[PDB]
């Protein structure tokens, strides 16, 4: 599914309000961008993660 | 235990037959009736049927048998007493044999 692999945070369903307040259901998708990290002997394994998690990995020295 | 068993003398206290003394030949507990010899004589109109070795003859005319009677209409008959009378029974347990025994309540006669 279109979801992160580190966390379980997925899409967010909501309303598409326009002028005249017409209601149409829409979906916000998370920015799943590929990322490589070093775990278990630094073994890089591409993992589709959200940019938010990408920032977290970068600050946590993990992303190297 | 049971008020009426197979063998003891019994009489009828209601119906067309009053004071009819007899011996219980068989007791059906589920439908609460009792076959007593000499009482409730019914005469089935015996037809003729021939489809078996015994049915080849099956000689049956005006055979008079026994009709079942409700146990409520039955009452135990006293024998030990010099003046026999009809009464109700208890369920005393004598410690001599530790076995339940029927005893009348208007006298002290066992069974």
């Amino acid at each position: 599914a279109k979801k992160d692999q580190l966390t379980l945070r997925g899409p967010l369903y909501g309303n598409n309000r326009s002028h005249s307040k017409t209601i149409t259901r829409r979906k916000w998708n998370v920015n799943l961008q590929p990322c490589k990290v070093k775990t278990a002997d630094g073994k890089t394994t591409r993992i589709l993660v959200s940019t938010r998690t990408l920032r977290t990995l970068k600050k946590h020295n993990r992303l190297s | 235990m049971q008020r009426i068993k197979k063998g003891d003398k019994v009489v009828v206290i209601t119906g067309k037959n009053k004071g009819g003394s007899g011996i219980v030949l068989k007791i059906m507990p589920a439908r609460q009736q009792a076959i007593v010899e000499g009482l409730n004589k019914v005469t089935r109109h015996k037809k003729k049927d021939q489809t078996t070795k015994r049915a080849a003859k099956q000689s049956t005319g005006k055979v008079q048998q026994e009709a079942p009677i409700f146990l409520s209409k039955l009452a135990l008959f006293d024998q030990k007493a010099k003046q026999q009378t009809i009464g109700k029974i208890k369920y005393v347990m004598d410690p001599k044999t530790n076995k339940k025994t029927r005893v009348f309540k208007k006298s002290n006669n066992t069974l």
Binding site: A1, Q5, L6, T7, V37, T39, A40, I47, T56, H60, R62 | -
Partner: protein, 204 residues
């Protein structure tokens, strides 16, 4: 929804946030939890009332009461004549199982209550199954004969041990009283009267 492999993600980070929140190290604390909670008390500085609360706890435990029942009994005794500091003591001590424990046929008050609930207990103008009836100063409590048919008997002895506000003859199973317990027979475990004022604020 796939091969989540908690090892894969947990080790993937080794600290992170989700990792540490879940950190299987998660012990049992299954004895820490119970006991400390159990029941506490002490007195503080800013409200004073701390003393009242602790004393209330002690009194309720001494007789095995729920706070709601206590509020009911205080409401009952509150209205009558005047300074009723002699009435509510009799009310708190008029419990049937309380009388049964001071009567001496049970090792402990709650055990006596269990007996009462199990239908051991015979009264005068009535009988009894509920362990909460308010008894009158001069009332009898004839004990059953079935309980004696189960000789554990050890009790009868306690009966004589007694406390002066209870007059019960051992073995013969009978009890009544007069001159309701004075404060001496209500020892210093809970002997204060500002718990009364605590309930006056909390209960109208």
């Amino acid at each position: 929804k796939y091969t989540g492999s908690i090892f894969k993600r947990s080790r993937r980070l080794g600290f992170s946030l989700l990792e540490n929140n879940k950190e299987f190290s998660k012990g049992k604390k299954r004895k820490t939890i119970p006991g400390q909670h159990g029941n506490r008390f002490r007195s503080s500085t800013m409200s004073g009332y701390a003393q009242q609360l602790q004393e209330k706890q002690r009194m309720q435990y001494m007789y095995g009461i729920t706070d709601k029942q206590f509020r009911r009994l205080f409401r009952l005794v509150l209205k009558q004549r005047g300074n009723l500091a002699v009435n509510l003591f009799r009310v708190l001590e008029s419990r049937l199982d309380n009388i049964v424990y001071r009567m001496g046929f049970a090792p402990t008050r709650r055990s006596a209550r269990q007996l009462v609930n199990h239908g051991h207990v015979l009264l005068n103008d009535r009988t009894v199954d509920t362990p909460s009836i308010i008894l009158n100063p001069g009332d009898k409590v004839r004990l059953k004969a079935k309980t004696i048919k189960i000789p554990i008997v050890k009790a009868a002895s306690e009966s004589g041990v007694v406390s002066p506000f209870v007059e019960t003859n051992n073995k013969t199973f009978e009890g009544t009283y007069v001159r309701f317990p004075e404060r001496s027979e209500l020892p210093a475990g809970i002997n204060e009267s500002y718990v009364v004022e605590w309930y006056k604020r909390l209960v109208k």
